[PDB]
């Protein structure tokens, strides 16, 4: 796909799976319109999130919604996560890996551009 | 202040000054109000942001954001920024800080509460 997730536990040191993934695109009335969304698998990784056809040039917003992800662990009770706004296809088409850190306190996302 | 901020440039190595930081607190309406913003001193660090009366218990988000921050070295744009978003004193009162360490296509923020 032209745009994919993979998110890693610093905590259990392995995939993060099931940590909900919600993309968005800034519309022209400068308001984030829903995109796309999903739940990782077993290896960090959301399968078949967006099409080529349907991700277009467009300011993004990918939000690794962590809310309650350590809840079992009894780990972060300020209830952290992030978001990575980048410029998806502003000369060309091209394929864009976010790849994501978790821990309690702190959060690290890393875009692969290619 | 109750809400500290502390920027890392990962490739100049040193406290990155100028960029520009903008808290939101999360309305009951379910929407981002304005909170505080300024932009990184020569420390990495901006000087009374939020008093302890004006920062209350709520949800607050820390957007990071950059203006060609990389220009100088020549190396590649790539429009990235990031948020953070914690839920603030959900018991008691407290001192956040908010680090964060800057790359072009890399982002890190770590939350030290105290």
């Known amino acids: 796909c032209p745009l994919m997730v993979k998110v890693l536990d610093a905590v259990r040191g392995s995939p993060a799976a ?4 919600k993309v968005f695109k800034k519309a022209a009335d400068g308001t984030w319109q829903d995109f796309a969304t999903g739940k ?3 290896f960090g990784e959301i399968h078949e999130l967006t099409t080529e056809e349907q991700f277009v040039e467009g300011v993004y917003r990918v939000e690794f919604d962590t809310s309650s992800y350590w809840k079992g662990l009894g780990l972060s ?7 990575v706004v980048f410029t998806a296809n502003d000369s060309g088409h091209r394929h864009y890996t976010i790849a994501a850190l978790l821990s309690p306190f702190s959060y690290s996302t890393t875009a692969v551009v290619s």
């Open 77 to 83: 009770p300020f209830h952290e996560y992030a978001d």
């Open 40 to 42: 990782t698998t077993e």
């Open 18 to 21: 099931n940590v909900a993934v």
